[PDB]
Design a protein around this nucleic acid. Sequence first.
RNA 1: AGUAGUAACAAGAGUCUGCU
Lengths: 701, 250, 739
Amino acid sequence: MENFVRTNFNPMILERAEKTMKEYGENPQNEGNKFAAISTHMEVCFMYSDFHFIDLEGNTIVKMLKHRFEIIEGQERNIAWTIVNSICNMTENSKPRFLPDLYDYKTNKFIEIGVTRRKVEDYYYEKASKLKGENVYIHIFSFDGEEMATDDEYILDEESRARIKTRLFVLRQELATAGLWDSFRQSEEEEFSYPPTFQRLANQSLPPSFKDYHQFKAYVSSFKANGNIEAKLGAMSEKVNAQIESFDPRTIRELELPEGKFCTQRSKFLLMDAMKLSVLNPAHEGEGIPMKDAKACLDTFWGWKKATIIKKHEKGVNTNYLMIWEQLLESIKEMEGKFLNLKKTNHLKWGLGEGQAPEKMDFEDCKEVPDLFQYKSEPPEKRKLASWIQSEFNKASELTNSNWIEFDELGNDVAPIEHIASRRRNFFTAEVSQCRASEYIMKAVYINTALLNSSCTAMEEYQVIPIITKCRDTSGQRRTNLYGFIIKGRSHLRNDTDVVNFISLEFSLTDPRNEIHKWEKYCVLEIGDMEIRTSISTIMKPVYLYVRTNGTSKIKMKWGMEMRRCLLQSLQQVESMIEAESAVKEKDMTEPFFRNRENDWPIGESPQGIEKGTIGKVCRVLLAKSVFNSIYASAQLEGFSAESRKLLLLIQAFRDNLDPGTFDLKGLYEAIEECIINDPWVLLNASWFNSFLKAVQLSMG
Amino acid sequence: SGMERIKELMEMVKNSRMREILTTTSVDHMAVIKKYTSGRQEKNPALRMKWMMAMKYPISASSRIREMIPEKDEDGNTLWTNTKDAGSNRVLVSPNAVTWWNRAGPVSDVVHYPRVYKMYFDRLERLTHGTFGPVKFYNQVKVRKRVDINPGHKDLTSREAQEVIMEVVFPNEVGARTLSSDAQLTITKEKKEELKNCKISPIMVAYMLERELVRRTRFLPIAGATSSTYVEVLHLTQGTCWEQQYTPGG
Amino acid sequence: MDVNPMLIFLKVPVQNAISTTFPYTGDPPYSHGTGTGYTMDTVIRTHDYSSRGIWKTNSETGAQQLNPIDGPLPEDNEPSGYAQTDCVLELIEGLDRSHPGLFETACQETIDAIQQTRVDKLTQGRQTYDWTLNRNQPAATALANTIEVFRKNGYKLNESGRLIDFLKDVLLSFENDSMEVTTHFQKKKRIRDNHSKKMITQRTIGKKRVKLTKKNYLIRALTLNTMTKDAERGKLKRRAIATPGMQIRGFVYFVELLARNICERLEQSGLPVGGNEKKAKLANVIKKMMAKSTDEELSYTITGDNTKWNENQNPRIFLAMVLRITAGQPEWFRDLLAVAPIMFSNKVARLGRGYMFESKSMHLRTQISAENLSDINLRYFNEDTKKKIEKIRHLMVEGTASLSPGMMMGMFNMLSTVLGVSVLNLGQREILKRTYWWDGLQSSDDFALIINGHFKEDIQQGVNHFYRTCKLVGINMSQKKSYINKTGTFEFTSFFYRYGFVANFSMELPSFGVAGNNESADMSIGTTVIKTNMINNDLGPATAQMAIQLFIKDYRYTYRCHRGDTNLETRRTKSIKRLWTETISKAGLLVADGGPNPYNLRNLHIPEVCLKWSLMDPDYRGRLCNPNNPFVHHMEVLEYDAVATTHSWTPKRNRSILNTNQRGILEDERIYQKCCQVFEKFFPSSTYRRPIGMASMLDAMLSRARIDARIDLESGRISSQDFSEITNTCKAIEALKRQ
RNA sequence: AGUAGUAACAAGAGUCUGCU
């Protein structure tokens, strides 16, 4: 049984038997015959193996030597097979089909020991027919005393064999006095139940007419459908229906744009109102270092005046901005080295927001504060659309004189599809490189790269970051442009949305008093005068400096550094147009797509009607659209695009005579106009959809 | 030869926590605690490399690099510094040290470097001696088929070449599996006859024989040839609306 | 002349230029602060779409549970969670009648894979809510914590090393009246910083053994941890996702394995498919629904989304489905597959991190947790949070809200696909015997529905029949965001079908920048990414060429490895130019060594060291591929010769937390690493192939050491003194093992 | 102040910076 095995044997045999029973999927508390049988096999094998040694010469001594037998039984099957493979690779013998019990180093033999309750002869012939085809020695014991090995040959001494026979006979006699020897000779799937806690959990996860999990399970298994769906459809209200309202774009309204104050500029740098101090072929012994090029571009401008606040930031302290510019210009005048870190004055501390966060404590100290109110979470205040963002997008699609993107080289083109792709890519790059959107890509890449490097190296420093770009002329001469300066605050960025505050000070020739709603967060000074040479006359125009406090995140800087995917996406759009053409015309339609020297594509809306342009204008407009998607990225733009895509596809389904229909069009209009709150670019996209809707309405009478 | 590792195991068993972990965790449970990572992860590794390469010493190397390269370059660049009171087997290293090693390091023999990566050199030989045809633009209808991204060896399936590899380089850990094919013993004998004079780790020649012998199939959208020498150039031979006719070398 | 890009749609169709409607070049929206509000939003919305159900009190957790199924039918077109059990069972029975042998073969393969699955399968995938630490840990970390807490108690069936015995231990651990856990505690001291000269609070995180109750352990075992989904496109407002725990993950794996076996044999399912397989399925259903017989067979298509898809499907409906699919199967299999809907029906939601509160007289702020949000006055909240807490106060059980109806985002995607495919399968011709018949395709929640008929009134009747049958089973079609047109153009999961031409825009285009591991790895990963986006995601060849150029530009910037003939002078440019000057064949230098770019469209499948090998200098290729290199870690047998280049170095790693000393909890990872290293010392193939065994690591290592000493002694490669030293060391290790 | 947007950052748990 169970208690006799623990009252009888050594703890080593019991530990080996418990390891084998836990490995094979048994237990001593459930089986008494199999546990005692495994203990009997282990005890016979251990008495077979122990007290046998091989000396330094080679003769078997029975009592600093080595053992004679290596035990393979009782070891785990991976451990035992490791021993078997190591022995079989030490000698030349092939592996047995199954695991033996012992290995004899002297005879070099795999010993198998089988102890049964029946006669020696029948169990021996069973194990001889089973272990057949290999040179595995067999040795069968029993409780009767007799033995029968392989061809009645025995490698062991007679004293040890008689000792194991005496141990087995004494074990049989102890089982006979215990009365358990009678049920010993007669002894020769998956389960997954629920414990009562999970059974009471299962009895509460049913449909409400049931109270037992097995009752509901028998109901599900013995279920037959008898028109239950139609019986529930006849009993449901008729107000649950999907009525198909017919869609006609001539009858639908336009998007309801919001009202209020005008939308202000919120880009991190000036786009079309930015002027640049440029040097041509710079060789000023810094040559690449940002502050050296900043001083080399600052030296090319004479005409600095005493700065005066000419347009106030209405919610701030404008004298602080004046002192910030004076301190910055004086520190650039006296700087030493490659980097400039400003002294943290009080106006710079106000302009960078130092001290504005409340001191974060743990709640266990601050339970006794009375006025502990939650952070308020208000929606954005709505803003009206102004013409400046349309003017900005108009300027961003135009050509410059500078080459703004320098691409690295490829491998040579050998495949014909590589020649086709290089022709397509060179057409797009010739039409797109001298664009203003490529200059904005360069500005954003440089600003976000420099802000990230300064934020992650100089966290406790008020570091001056000059807005630098570089370009090539039509003659290949290098030009280095300076647009302004960024004074970085303290940047201990832990989250992805933690804001580093900075101050941007940008040069400009545009008077801020002509469009004063655009410059809401800015404090514009008048720092100089420039003799601007026009085509005939030479005028003296004032040079302003737009100063504002801005802020950015690690995620925003990360996406600003990856700004050439705008160039990837615009090329992807133009190439998908070419691919959808060539999938029907069945030839390389790249050359009748870029060599169209006529205007074929509607891209504008003058007061005289709708204006067309060439394919290079279209690729520059697609680049500018991707760039403005990258600059004014918001959740409003994402939601508006995802919701108005459906209305665009409905208008396309109308134009294809595919008879479009809707189910709740007012809900779709509310979902579109919910995402139009205060961002200038999403307001311009809403106005663009309204203009396209009016155009496709007037196209069909 | 067997004594230092058992003395290291004895010094680990003298620690109580290592002894409890070694005695309680099994050989099948040490595939779970092999990936036990506890600490603050990084969400932007690309941005981390961006701002870490701008620092002076982004590379983490061993202590032997204290005696293999100098401290200072020829141009005055400090190739390596120490850590803050860490005399361990790890220092900090600038990539100027890597450029130093590539321009003024010790030249060796690299005769085993082609034969480990013979699959990639075979791909380069098929691409260099391939002949392209005219592109044909039409509506490409690619069907998802189970195709052979690695042809492997003949007379060896995917569950049998792995047993050949387990026989060749890790012979005392094959378990109960035997060699049940006449080609298996010949391939095993040849691969053991090759890989004897080699100071390369057995995992690397195991992956070498894996990319030489173990066949790999994968579902891929193909409209054309489904051979193994055409699966690898699927990016080059077809697209959405075209087809690059190609004949590989051989 | 004001520019408008949308007027491009006047010439080209919308599906030909649909890429302009995806502003995926800027940053996606992120959530700032906690996600308690979105969690309470989901709880309130799920209890309000089901509010005509029956309220009960759970006898085991004490949580209020709402039962909406087999309740009153919906009276309007609002989202409703009153799914009918008989209608669900009728649809699954019809799906079985339509596909003979589908359920039997899928259940057979699930039984085949249950018995041949280790616990290591739970180390793969997303992160997991560790109930020990009340946080999210990685999968292997939370699994090791679960196994350690189970085996420190009396639950050691997982020592078998297969998944079902671990699940048996999970279900057995619910009976323990006092579970002993090892939770991270924290000591706080106030230290003046030496740089800023400011009083910070240094936190020392250690370990502490705590004694949970039966109720506390069951609440923690039923918990889903909620957090806001960040970087999600196409939406204005944020939503909360949830991560499961360790007590439910294996059961969810078995149920999703069964439903994945179902959905692969179904034609009308868009899961689990890839990029071109979904295009082929779109072409297949448009082909099969355009077989006209009479003079005028009308055919329409609904591009349909579902509104509040996870908020309305009950776990009890999934229980009925998983008991109807597993029909004629053994009861252990039915109970094992039914555990996970029972656990999701009794589940609870952890409410996030709490809220930040602000004292404007003391000028302080404090993050108070979601457990502390109960015993605080309602005057200190704002209006939305006061409404949320008033609606949620009766559902709170020990920091967590009882979310008994509904699901969460991405738990049973394939089972919900099975239910949607059963609704789609109802509308065959000679099953309905009607004037209309529908076919189509079903994703997780998105669907495309082709309805054929004879008149447009029959099309309307078919739309109404499909809609009301969906409302019977708790599926709510979004009327605001679905539309219908004639067959030939539609959209399915941002796949845009127009007359055969399919535009794939389901995936965002990657940055094609540096990956951030090392130089050689980023080069290989970048070329492989360009190649796989060419093959799978329809990347055009010129866009791929510009992607190679942008990747080489970003790679040369990031590792400061511009070419030797450049005029940029970075930190590394002097050594790179010295390498450039003394190199004869400059075409063989790698891009990380200042060499040219070799890549184009034709050789993306070839690594860079192999691609430039014929062009290298012999001295340069000897120095670059020197096997005695000091940058790559060497493993001992003296060590082996390396077969990797010197650009496979290792960046300086940093996992430090501000003002946090966590060396008391980071020791166990180093101990596990040292144990794995010494086991790989004793076993050469523990890192090429995973080792098996129910024996201990120490028993296996000593059994290897004794037999290797005996084999080296019997082969003459060792002396008897070393043999005796090894055997005495093994005896000493065994004696310290037993003591 | 500013970033920002349904809740937060605006510090105290998450020796460095060069893209023609």
